[PDB]
Paper text:
[name] (IR) is a receptor tyrosine kinase that plays critical roles in cellular signaling, growth, and metabolism. IR can be activated by two highly related ligands – insulin and insulin-like growth factor 2 ([name]). Consequently, IR-B has an additional 12 amino acids at the C-terminal helix of the alpha subunit (α-CT), while IR-A lacks this segment. Here, we present cryo-EM structures of full-length human long isoform IR (IR-B) in both the inactive and [name]-bound active states, and short isoform IR (IR-A) in the [name]-bound active state.
The 3D reconstruction of class 2 (determined at 3.8 Å resolution for IR-A/[name], comprising 19% of the particles; determined at 4.2 Å resolution for IR-B/[name], comprising 22% of the particles) showed an Ƭ-shaped asymmetric conformation with three [name] molecules bound. The asymmetric structures of IR-A/[name] are nearly identical to that of IR-B/[name]. In one half of the asymmetric IR/[name] complex, the two [name] molecules bind to site-1’ in the head of Ƭ-shape and site-2’ in the middle regions of the receptor. In the other half of the asymmetric complex, the third [name], located in the middle region of the Ƭ-shaped structure, is sandwiched between site-1 and site-2’ from two adjacent IR protomers. This asymmetric IR/[name] complex exhibits similar architecture to the recently reported cryo-EM structure of IR/insulin complex at subsaturated insulin concentrations. Interestingly, in the presence of saturated [name], most IR-A (84% of total particles) and IR-B (86% of total particles) particles adopt a Ƭ-shaped asymmetric conformation, distinct from the IR-A particles in response to saturated insulins showing a single T-shaped symmetric conformation. Hence, it is reasonable to speculate that the predominant adoption of asymmetric conformations of IR in response to saturated [name] (about 84% and 86% of total particles for IR-A and IR-B, respectively) might result from the comparatively weaker binding of [name] at IR site-2. In the asymmetric state, one [name] is simultaneously contacting site-1 and site-2’ from two protomers, similar to the IR/insulin complex at subsaturated insulin concentrations. Therefore, it is likely that [name]’s lower efficiency in promoting the T-shaped IR is due to its comparatively weak IR site-2 binding affinity. In addition, the 12-residue extension in the C-terminus of α-CT, the unique structural element that only exists in IR-B, was not resolved in the cryo-EM map of IR-B/[name] complex, suggesting that this structural element is not involved in the ligand binding or stabilizing the active conformation of IR.
Author numbering:
A (entry chain E): 8 to 24, 41 to 64
B (entry chain B): 1 to 161, 168 to 518, 528 to 539, 546 to 656, 699 to 718, 768 to 917
C (entry chain A): 3 to 152, 179 to 270, 274 to 314, 317 to 346, 351 to 522, 527 to 541, 545 to 573, 577 to 656, ...
D (entry chain D): 6 to 32, 37 to 63
E (entry chain C): 8 to 29, 43 to 62
Write the structure that this text describes.
């Protein structure tokens, strides 16, 4: 997924808490998205 | 009727027809008839020969490379039923390499008790598809017919049909034997008991054909048994059954057994009496009595040894196995080799299975139709004295459908010596071979490469362990999956999950298309899970998972899987309404037609349609409608990734129109519309209405109503005012309700006895000049007619204005 | 300048780390400040960085709450050099709340880049800023979604932007507006003073702005001068860190040597590198699982480690890999499902194997199934320095390739018993190396047949027809059956009949691309009993040429009344090397319908111009044959044309003005022997009209009659723009208006001009203009006559 | 030369021809014709022995 | 692909040998160059 619609993916997987190069260009790896969660945000 | 004539024990005819006269005076044959290998024969030679006597053949009929023959009908016009007790390579009737054979001609054959028909490589035969083997046999699928004249070429099977025709696959076709003979069909109620010409049922015990309906005495064949012409279902004493078709008095079997014993024939059998049956030899658990030919049961455990020639036998067809029927001890080895394509397990377990012990080895090579060796019912021990080369006792190779080895829930086994061998068994499981290894007791006799670790069951599903879907989340096009992490005893053995899925419109789904996703095993919490992608909304899908392990042969870890799981996505905004058309069938009635959206995206609740009325063009009120051209119309990072990597850096890795609700309707009628006027209409399919109604894009369309008639015509009289200079200013109320609007008024004014002139009063001419004016008119009677041209067209000319100036 | 080096850094989640910027003057980097949510205005009126002057790379702000004016925090920030442009931009400030004004009165210029301002509901005072005075380029700005859009030049209500004189284009204007030094930029403490320059136009050097960097000081990031000592120190600092390994070249501390250049251990200079010599990559072990793992391998050429590849499944790896040329350690392939061959490693010719796989192995292969080939060992060269080879469970690699392995690598004695297994390799690989000879071929422009020598296994029944493989061959070389886990259009053949003379199998193709190169081979098909297949060499055949296609896009322009310039594009199907184009042109007669239409009346407008089953079926047939045979027999006890050569354009001269011309264009790929020329391409083009063609040439002759009737005779412009539809006449009498008349072609014909009757007494005039296809010409001279 | 079924019969009735083929009684020994002429090439004598009278 | 269009192929396969008409083995069935070999008679 590319810019903007990967925001939906991060909304889903991250829940209540490099980018685009990984999903628009590379394969969206899921587990990569999980550790991206900004718990201390 | 009875069976006049002899019984003609089975024979063969070779190298000339002069031997055929052996069939002179017999109507039945004990055994098999082989006509084959005719070279110096021609059709005129065959035309003389005939045998109306023959009725039923015991074992089989075989024709192989008989020259000069074209149609068998003149030879065997009365063969009715083929018993087929002892087949010829699992085939009851073989028609092979018939040159010149144009047509079969067996219009009296009815049933074949057990067997199949194989006709091939003749390149001279047609009238093939015009016959129905279903009414002839019981197992049609076992038939094998290829390489004829009928198939590759198009030999016309011209035959009357006059004769019955019936469906075979999806269409009717005549069922004809010859150009003058056709298959005898009759109601299925008397399925095999026979049926006369008028359709009346034959006797219950009867079979095929009969002269007197429902009369055992006057039949030609009966399915049960034969005795003294009037055959009976089960004859009483002192008649013992024989060759499963006729029973004889004890004296007959007695004298024939004596004829076999005194004349030491290498083929004759010392017949015995057992359960009132003069069979060639009664099985294990019985002993021949010299006094009376009954074989009394033995007072001991002596099995019937079944010694093998050259210590080895090959089982490839039914006739190969039937030699071993009743045998229970084999002083040799066994090589199952069934080059098939159709199942044979039935007759194999019927004839085999009674075997218990194998002196030599066993080997199952190249078999294809075998699904499980369970048909070896009572096999218990494999002594393996005749050890196969490579010091092997049990063997296997290239068995494409070998599913199950044995039912280990209840079946014992024992292997004395020798080691195993398994290779190229794509439908097996290492679980099954390991279970056999444990049961066998040869567990310490296993060595490397005796059991291939990959070819055994390439594509099966026997991981024997279950997985649980820990969490599920649904959405439009994203489905989040999560399951319990799996960990074999050594985590290095686990190598990754495979998630298989496929869209499932229904509930009938198999196991084992089927799109795959690879999942990296997690690092030892942390449920592996996976997130879905690319879904179509409101659609059901079947999903399951699978584990992958290493060879793991020393242990018994086989991975796991999940059960087949159904789950469907959600509904969303539907697609555009389809086929939007609008036709005004009346001046105020418009029909609107549309089709459901190509993507309903859920159960379409309704359609939402709005409409309104446009306004006429302003320029249409200030146009000169009598100048030239007066024709009035009738109706790659770039900017896109700029913000993307902006979000990347920011986020950073962490260390009112009239309307209604049209329900269940694709056609609308709209009334109360201004005649000949355009209207704007839109429509939106709606798959969700009550909960915050969700509708698709508007279905834009526009349509103008049918014009009226009086609207164009001028309403109101014509008034004139004449000045002193003979100038006539003309008044007439316009049709204030025209078809849309009026662009001009044509004024046709004439003199008395003179020509008629046309003048244009456009909208600006009528309004700005406040009517119209005529200048330069000489005195005399006049006649002025006015016609209004509206958007639709022209009106009616007014009455002629009679006046003098 | 009193301050710190100040490398670029970022601040998020709070304003605490912002205090670190207290002791800084000039930023050698970029500032990216964002994630300010618990931020209120009152907490930002007490902080300021007057010492901060210049930002080297760029500035980004995002999600800013509380801030309303940056004049406080950044009062004395002067110039953003934009040494590292943020995607051709130097300033991106996005999604602010409460931020109403700019406040950066001390910004005068930006060396390079532009600005991006978007989604700012509060920002105002945008109409009082001159971007042209500040930034030399104003076409790249993008300022949308602000408060101003939802003249005095002033930053804030109390700060003016100030306008330098046009003479001070880049020197800067001082308090009196006097131009500053050439090296001065934006502003200066004293006019025409390099020492007093507020900003350095080209380079900075110890408080003095200079144009260049004298040696040994090299141009550091095109903004300052740094000697070899500090540049090498930064090089070493990156050397022992995670990076921009600095190297000196052309008196510039570039973060890497460019193409064809290499840094030397003696000196950071980028000496001209030898040929490609791209790089060396380091690890000692790395595995590749899929495309992603091999992504960073791009550009890796010499590997100072070992490679263990396991691809759980093609051309994607061919893109990722294939740039590898040597491996220091041992190579292993393990359980790569989606691997068919090793053709990707084009340049692998020597391996050192100093590190040895367990068991002292140099090349390890285990549990790989779909492997079919390794390389073109006929031409590919491979060397092994030392080690051992392991081949096990490789079912689809027949032993001929394994034999060629050591004979090419020179490891004949390096391998030991059981190093290469016999029964676990090439089980499905059924290479039988029986050669098929092609009888002959012959080619037509559209089609081609194919016949080859016969072949029969020992049991002639065992042969089950031939497979024929073909596709297009761009160049003279191509692989065989590689594809993926594969294009190669295939067609089956039935076996030929036994002639017990000998027929040939043969086959004719069906459809193809004319004048193209095809690669074809034929493979046998026989059921295993042993395996007695066969295969043929990859044969390249060239389909003969034919007539080409039509040249594309014929366009014609009337650059002159006689010159027509033609252009087109090469035909879609060249079908041979195009010898030339054939061009024909012919004058198109104008529409004669004008000659009978009286255009003087209404209508004055004038236009101007899957397989196991059948194998088993054969086996079934054969085994029944054998059973029958065994049981039966028992032994005893023309147009003006042009040959346009190597040109896609043309020009045609000698053409009349405003004249249509039909143009016919073919392409001929053949020149001397009856040129193959395609069908025509047709286009009509009209030259531009002459300006004087429609103007009437000839004085007007008039004949006054007794009853005041005038007979007007005038000479038409015999060479008009095509023709003259009508003549417009403006005749005026003394004391009267200019009455108008229209003389049609028929009117000029039968009346010999005009015949006007009933003329009022007085002096008339006669002005006549011709209306040709181009338009009205010139009015005639007024003929004054007193009637 | 090696020959197998189909053409094997055509090879017969020419080398043997005329008179028929010997056939007494079944009396399957895994050596009949296929593993002697189709599996492995055979001479004329191995075929001549399959004639009836000589 | 049968009568009318294939005549060129008929000249193609055999050249200067000549054939006799019949085609319904190729616009319903298939051409395999065997029947193309046969129909063109010497």
């Amino acid at each position: 997924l590319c810019g903007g619609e990967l925001v939906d993916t991060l909304q889903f997987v991250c829940g209540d808490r490099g980018i685009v190069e990984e999903c628009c260009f590379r394969s969206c790896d899921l587990a990569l998205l999980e550790t991206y969660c900004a718990t201390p945000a | 009727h009875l069976y006049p004539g002899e019984v003609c024990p089975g024979m063969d005819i070779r190298n000339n027809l002069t031997r055929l006269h052996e069939l002179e005076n017999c109507s039945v044959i004990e055994g098999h008839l082989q006509i084959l290998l005719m070279f110096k024969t021609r059709p005129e030679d065959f035309r003389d020969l005939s045998f109306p006597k023959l009725i039923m053949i015991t074992d089989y009929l075989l024709l192989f490379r008989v020259y000069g023959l074209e149609s068998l009908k003149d030879l065997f016009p009365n063969l009715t039923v083929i018993r087929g007790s002892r087949l010829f390579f699992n085939y009851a009737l073989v028609i092979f390499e018939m040159v010149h054979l144009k047509e079969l001609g067996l219009y009296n054959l009815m049933n074949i008790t057990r067997g199949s028909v194989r006709i091939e490589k003749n390149n001279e035969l047609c009238y093939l598809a015009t016959i129905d083997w279903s009414r002839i046999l019981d197992s049609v699928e076992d038939n094998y017919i290829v390489l004829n004249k009928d198939d590759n070429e198009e030999c016309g099977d011209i035959c009357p049909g006059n004769c019955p025709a019936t469906v075979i696959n999806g269409q009717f076709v005549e069922r004809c034997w010859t150009h003058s003979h056709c298959q005898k069909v009759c109601p299925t109620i008397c399925k095999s008991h026979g049926c006369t010409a008028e359709g009346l049922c034959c006797h219950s015990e009867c079979l095929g054909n009969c002269s007197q309906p429902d009369d055992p005495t006057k039949c030609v064949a009966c399915r049960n048994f034969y005795l003294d012409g009037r055959c009976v279902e089960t004859c009483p004493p002192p008649y013992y059954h024989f060759q499963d078709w006729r029973c004889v008095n004890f004296s007959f079997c007695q004298d024939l057994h004596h004829k076999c014993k005194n004349s030491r024939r290498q083929g004759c059998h010392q017949y015995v009496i057992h359960n009132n049956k003069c069979i060639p030899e009664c099985p294990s658990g019985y002993t021949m009595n010299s006094s009376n030919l009954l074989c009394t049961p033995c007072l001991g455990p002596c099995p019937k040894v079944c010694h093998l020639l050259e210590g080895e036998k090959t089982i490839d067809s039914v006739t190969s196995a039937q030699e071993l029927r009743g045998c229970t001890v084999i002083n040799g080895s066994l090589i199952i080799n069934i080059r098939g394509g159709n199942n044979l397990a039935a007759e194999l377990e019927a004839n085999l299975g009674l075997i218990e012990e194998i002196s030599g080895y066993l080997k199952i090579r190249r078999s294809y139709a075998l699904v499980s060796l369970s048909f070896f019912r009572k096999l218990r021990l494999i002594r393996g004295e005749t050890l196969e080369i490579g010091n092997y006792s049990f063997y296997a190779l290239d068995n494409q459908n070998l599913r199950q080895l044995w039912d280990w829930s209840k079946h014992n086994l024992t292997i004395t010596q020798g080691k195993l061998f398994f290779h190229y068994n794509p439908k097996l499981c290492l679980s099954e071979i390991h279970k056999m290894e444990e049961v066998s007791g040869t567990k310490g006799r296993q060595e490397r490469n005796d059991i291939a670790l990959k070819t055994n069951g390439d594509q099966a599903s026997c991981e024997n362990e279950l997985l649980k879907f820990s969490y599920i989340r649904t959405s439009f096009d994203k489905i989040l999956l999560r399951w319990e992490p799996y960990w074999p005893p050594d985590f290095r053995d686990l190598l990754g999950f495979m998630l298989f899925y496929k869209e499932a419109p229904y509930q009938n789904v198999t196991e084992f298309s089927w799109t795959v996703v690879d999942i990296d095993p997690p690092l030892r919490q942390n449920h592996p899970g996976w997130l879905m992608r690319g879904l179509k909304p409101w659609t059901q899908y079947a999903i399951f998972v699978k584990t992958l392990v290493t060879f793991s042969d020393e242990r018994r870890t086989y991975g796991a899987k999940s059960d087949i799981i159904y789950v469907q996505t959600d509904a969303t905004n539907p697609s555009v309404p389809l086929d939007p058309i609008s036709v005004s069938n009346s001046s105020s009635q418009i029909i609107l037609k549309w089709k459901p959206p190509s993507d309903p995206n859920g159960n379409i609740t309704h359609y939402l349609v709005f409409w309104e009325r446009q306004a006429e063009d302003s320029e249409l009120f200030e146009l000169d409608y009598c100048l030239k051209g007066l024709k009035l119309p009738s109706r790659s990072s770039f900017r896109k990734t700029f913000e993307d990597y902006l979000h990347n850096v920011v986020f950073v890795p962490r260390k009112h129109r009239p309307f209604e609700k049209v329900v269940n309707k694709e056609s609308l009628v709209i009334s109360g519309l201004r005649h000949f006027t355009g209207y704007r209409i839109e429509l939106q399919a709606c798959n969700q209405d009550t909960p915050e109604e969700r509708c698709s894009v508007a279905a834009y369309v526009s349509a103008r109503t049918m014009p009226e008639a009086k609207a164009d015509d001028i309403v109101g009289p014509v008034t004139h005012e004449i000045f002193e200079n003979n100038v006539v200013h003309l008044m007439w109320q316009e049709p204030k309700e025209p078809n849309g609007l009026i662009v001009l008024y044509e004024v046709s004014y004439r003199r008395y006895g003179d020509e008629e002139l046309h003048l244009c009063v456009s909208r600006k001419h009528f309004a700005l000049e406040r009517g119209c004016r005529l200048r330069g008119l000489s005195p005399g009677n006049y006649s002025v007619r006015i016609r209004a041209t509206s958007l639709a067209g022209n009106g009616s000319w007014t009455e002629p204005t009679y006046f003098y100036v």
